[PDB]
Each structure stands twice: as structure tokens, then as C-alpha cells.
Amino acid sequence: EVAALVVDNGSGMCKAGFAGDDAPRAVFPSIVGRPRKDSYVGDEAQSKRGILTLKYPIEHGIVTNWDDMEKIWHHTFYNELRVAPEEHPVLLTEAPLNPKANREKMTQIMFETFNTPAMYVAIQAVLSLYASGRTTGIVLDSGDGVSHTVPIYEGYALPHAILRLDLAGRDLTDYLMKILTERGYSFTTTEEREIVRDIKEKLCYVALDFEQEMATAASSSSLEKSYELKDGQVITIGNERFRCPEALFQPSFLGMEACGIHETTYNSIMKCDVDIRKDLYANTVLSGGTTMYPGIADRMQKEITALAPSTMKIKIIAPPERKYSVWIGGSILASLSTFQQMWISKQEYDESGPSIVHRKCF
Ligand SMILES: Nc1ncnc2c1ncn2[C@@H]1O[C@H](COP(=O)(O)OP(=O)(O)OP(=O)(O)O)[C@@H](O)[C@H]1O
Ligand SMILES: [Ca+2]
Ligand SMILES: [Ca+2]
Numbered sequence: 079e080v081a082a083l084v085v086d087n088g089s090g091m092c093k094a095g096f097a098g099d100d101a102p103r104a105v106f107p108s109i110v111g112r113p114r115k116d117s118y119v120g121d122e123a124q125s126k127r128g129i130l131t132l133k134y135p136i137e138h139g140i141v142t143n144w145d146d147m148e149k150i151w152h153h154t155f156y157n158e159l160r161v162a163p164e165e166h167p168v169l170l171t172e173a174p175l176n177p178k179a180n181r182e183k184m185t186q187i188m189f190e191t192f193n194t195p196a197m198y199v200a201i202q203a204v205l206s207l208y209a210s211g212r213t214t215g216i217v218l219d220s221g222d223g224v225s226h227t228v229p230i231y232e233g234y235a236l237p238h239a240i241l242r243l244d245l246a247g248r249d250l251t252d253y254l255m256k257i258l259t260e261r262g263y264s265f266t267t268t269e270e271r272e273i274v275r276d277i278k279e280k281l282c283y284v285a286l287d288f289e290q291e292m293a294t295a296a297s298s299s300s301l302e303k304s305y306e307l308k309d310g311q312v313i314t315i316g317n318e319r320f321r322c323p324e325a326l327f328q329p330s331f332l333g334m335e336a337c338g339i340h341e342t343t344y345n346s347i348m349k350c351d352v353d354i355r356k357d358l359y360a361n362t363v364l365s366g367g368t369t370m371y372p373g374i375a376d377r378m379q380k381e382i383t384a385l386a387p388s389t390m391k392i393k394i395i396a397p398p399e400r401k402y403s404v405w406i407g408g409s410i411l412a413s414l415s416t417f418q419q420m421w422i423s424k425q426e427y428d429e430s431g432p433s434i435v436h437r438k439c440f
Contacts, residue, residue: 080165080166080167081096081097081098081161081166082096082097082098082166082167082168082169082412082413083095083096083097083155083159083161083163083166083167083168083169084096084097084102084168084169084171084405084408084409084412085151085154085168085169085170085171086102086171086202086205086404086405086408087108087136087141087147087150087170087171087172088108088136088139088221088222088223089108089134089136089137089138089139089221089222089223089224089246089248090107090108090136090221090222090223090247090248091105091106091107091108091221091222091367092105092106092107092108092150092154093105093402093404093405094154094158094159094405095159095405095409096159096409097169097408097409097410097411097412097413098409098413099409100406100409101399101402101405101406102402102405103158103159104154104158104159106119106120106121106153106158107120107121107123107124108134108135108136108150109123109124109132109133109134110123110132110133110135110146110149110150111123111124111126111127111130111131111132111133112130112131112133113129113130113131114129114130114131117149118130119149119150119153119157120153127268133146134146135147135149135150136223137223138173138223138224138242138244139173139174139176139221139223139224139226140173140176140177140180141176141180141183141184144183144187147187148187148191151187151192155192163188163192163193163194164192164193164194164195165195166194166195167194167195167196167197167198167412167421168188168192168194168196168197168198169197169198169200169408169411169412170184170188170197170198170199170200171199171200171201171202171205171404171405171408172184172199172200172201172202173201173202173224173226174201174202174203174219174226174228174235174240174242175237175240175242178436181199181435181436181439182432182433182435183432184199184435185197185199185422185427185432185434185435186432189424189427189428193424194424195423195424196421196422196423196424197421197422198412198420198421198422198438198439199435199439200407200408200411200439201228201235201440202219202365202404203217203219203226203228203230203235203240203365203404204217204228204230204233204235204407205403205404205405205406205407205408205410205411206219206363206365206400206403206404206407207230207233207363207407208233208407208410208411209397209403209404209406209407209410210363210395210397210403212361212363213230213232213233214230214231214232214233214354214357214358214361215230215357215358215361215362215363215395216228216229216230216343216346216347216358216361216362216363217230217362217363217364217365218339218342218343218362218363218364218365218366218369218378219365219366219369219404220246220247220326220339220365220366220367220368220369221246221247221366221367221368222246222247222248222367222368223244223246223247223248224242224243224244224246225242225243225244225245225246225339225342225366225368226240226241226242226243227240227241227243227339227342227343227345227346228240228346229346229347229349229350229354229358231354231357236349236350238349239346239347239349239350240346241342241345241346241349243329243336243337243339243342244336245325245326245329245332245334245336246366246368247275247278247367247368249325249332250278250322250323250325250326250368251271251274251275251278252271253322253325253331253332254274254277254278254282254318254322255270255271255274257318257321257322258274258277258313258315258318261318263313273307273308277305277315278322279370280305281303281305281315281319282318282319282320282322282323282371283319283320283323283371283372283373284320284323284324284326284327284371284372284373284374284377285320285324285373285377286373286376286377286380288320288324288328291317291320292317292321295316295317296317299316301316301317301319301320302314302315302316303315303319323368323371323374326338326339326368326374327339327340327377327381338381339378340377340378340381340382340385341381341385343362343378343382344382344385344386347359347386356390356391359382359386359390359391359392359393360391360392360393361393361395362378362382362392362393362394362395363395363396363397363403364378364394364395364396364397364400365400365403365404366400366401366403366404367401369396369400370400370401374396375394375396376394378394379392379393379394382394420438420439421438422434422435422438422439426438
């Protein structure tokens with residue numbers, strides 16, 4: 079048969095490729111822009127922020143604007159991948175607990191706007207579990223605009239226990255800007271957010287112990303690293319390195335009341351049947367770009383261990399490529415001989431309409 083396409087749309091980044099590959103073929107920004115061609119998507123839209131009025135179709139993980147998304151998909155198919163959708167089964171990914179209505183429009187749009195011969199909508203968190211080699215376990219997926227702790231058992235996500243923490247890599251990028259500014263630098267523009275995001279990605283890490291790290295940085299220079307601007311200037315970053323991602327465990331640094339990611343994972347586990355919690359503790363999988371900070375795994379271990387019973391075996395799984403675990407899970411799933419029957423065919427759609435996405439998905 080032909081090649082299945084795996085499209086993973088995020089709040090900040092869109093990843094797309096072909097099932098069978100172990101990495102997406104294309105990855106671009108999830109922003110669209112129209113004058114203030116006729117529309118612009120990705121980097122090209124970002125380089126005209128001035129002349130175009132930009133939009134962000136995916137917000138906190140949920141498609142907020144459809145014609146915007148329809149355009150991102152058009153971009154994916156014809157520009158990035160260069161394939162005719164009507165010639166490839168497409169596998170989409172959606173955020174946990176995304177409304178039943180969005181699920182139907184995704185289906186409807188794929189069959190009536192792009193003429194896909196088949197398609198399927200899968201839950202992101204679950205695709206990551208599949209990618210780690212498990213069917214049972216709790217996932218902490220943290221992207222650029224939203225975090226979710228998702229308990230899964232025997233391949234099914236547990237809807238009543240899924241939690242949402244609106245604190246991801248974006249908040250972290252702005253926070254790093256704020257603290258480097260207070261430090262004496264000045265990072266406030268959109269072009270600079272782009273620079274600080276890179277800083278955050280190459281120099282930041284999670285301290286095993288906040289205070290001790292802070293104490294070493296106040297009395298020593300050992301934790302400092304240098305970063306060079308395209309313009310040539312070298313700037314140093316010390317405690318901002320760990321102080322930035324610490325906001326994941328302590329949202330109050332950002333004036334947020336929500337509890338940390340470690341505590342949110344623990345709260346999701348407890349909303350579960352006491353008979354499967356051990357399976358979750360021993361199978362806590364880290365997913366998403368925000369979970370890439372050096373030292374986050376050891377930290378999560380220590381924080382969970384302290385929140386859970388002393389007789390509890392805790393194990394944090396952090397795949398080296400978790401930045402794309404979601405997409406790889408879709409590449410892995412759409413390849414399975416047993417998943418071929420899950421696809422929603424054009425035929426199945428015509429006869430049963432959009433409401434069939436609940437019957438074949440989920
Ligand atoms: N090495 C890294 N260290 C820390 N953060 C990183 C790293 N690499 C990428 N990120 C951050 O990961 C975020 C993007 O991750 P991802 O693409 O998984 O999320 P998304 O799908 O775009 O959005 P979301 O899943 O929350 O709706 C960005 O904030 C990016 O800066
Ligand atoms: Ca995502
Ligand atoms: Ca707090």
C-alpha cells in the first residue's frame with residue numbers, strides 16, 4: 079500500500095513525516111499570517127510579523143481556529159512533505175480531553191477538504207507510551223503551550239484522571255527573558271524571544287536541589303556558561319540556567335497557583351484505581367520538549383519519591399528522543415499490522431459521517 083502520513087500538531091511546533099521513519103521529515107512553527115501569497119505559514123510568516131497579523135491556531139493544545147489549521151495542514155501536505163493528501167492515509171494527533179466536537183471537524187476537514195482516503199485521530203500522550211514500549215503507565219507530556227499528566231492502562235487513557243497544567247515551554251521562555259533582564263541584560267522583543275528560547279534550550283537544566291544550587295551560584299562561578307549573540311557579543315548566564323525550569327516544580331515563581339509537575343503527576347495517579355497506581359509509579363514516562371532539561375529525570379524521581387509511600391518503587395523513564403516521542407509513536411502505530419483496521423476509510427466516512435470518529439477512535 080501507499081505511505082501513511084503522521085501529523086502531530088502542537089501549540090508551538092508542528093511535526094510531520096511518514097509512518098515507518100523514526101523522525102519527522104518536517105518541523106515548522108504553528109503560526110499563520112495574513113496581510114495587515116494571501117496567507118503565510120511557518121518561519122516565512124514569522125519573518126514578516128510586521129507586515130502580517132499573526133495567528134496561533136493551536137492554543138494550549140486545542141485547535142482554536144479552524145481555517146487557520148486548515149492552512150497549516152495545507153502547508154504540511156503541499157509545501158513541507160510535497161504529497162497529495164488524497165493519496166495517503168493520514169494519522170492526526172490531538173491533545174488529551176480535546177472536545178468531542180473538535181475531533182469531528184478534524185475528521186470532516188480531512189475527508190471533505192483534503193479528500194484523504196483514510197485517517198485517524200490519536201491521543202498524543204498515548205503515542206508516547208507506545209513509543210517507550212509500554213501500553214500501561216502515566217505520561218507527563220509538556221510542550222510549548224501546555225502540560226498534561228496522562229494515566230494510561232492497557233493502552234487506554236483514563237479520562238477522569240487526566241490533568242492539565244497550563245505551564246509549558248512558552249512560559250519558560252518569557253520567564254528566562256524576565257530574569258536575564260533583571261540581571262542587567264535586555265530581552266523583550268519578539269526577535270529576542272527567539273534568541274532566549276535558544277539560550278533556554280542549550281544552557282538550562284533542572285537543579286537536583288534548588289537552594290543548594292542557588293548557594294553554589296552565589297558564592298562560586300562554576301555554574302556559569304557563556305552564550306554568544308549573532309552580533310558577536312558574549313553574555314554569561316549563571317543561576318538563570320536552573321532558575322528558569324524550576325518554575326515547572328514551583329509555578330508560583332510565575333505567580334501561578336497551580337501545583338508543580340511532580341505534584342500534578344502524583345495527583346493524577348491518585349485519581350486512579352488503587353490497583354494500578356504501582357504500575358504508574360514504576361512507569362512514569364517523560365514526554366515533550368519541555369521535559370528535555372538536563373537533570374529533570376533525577377529531580378522528578380526525588381520529588382515523586384518524597385510524595386509517595388516509602389514502600390513505593392518509583393521509576394522515571396526519559397527517552398533520549400522524547401522531544402518527538404509523540405510523533406514516533408504515531409509512526410510506530412500506523413505501521414502496525416493490527417492498526418490497519420482502525421483507519422477510518424473514505425467509504426466509512428461517507429456512510430456514517432463525522433460522528434464515526436468516536437466509533438473508530440476513542
Ligand atoms: N532541549 C530542550 N530543552 C528545553 N526545552 C526544549 C528543548 N528543546 C525544545 N524545547 C522546548 O520544547 C517546546 C516545544 O515542544 P513540543 O513541540 O513538544 O510542544 P508543542 O507540541 O509545540 O506544544 P504543546 O505540545 O504544549 O501543545 C518549546 O518550548 C521548546 O523551546
Ligand atoms: Ca505536542
Ligand atoms: Ca506554589
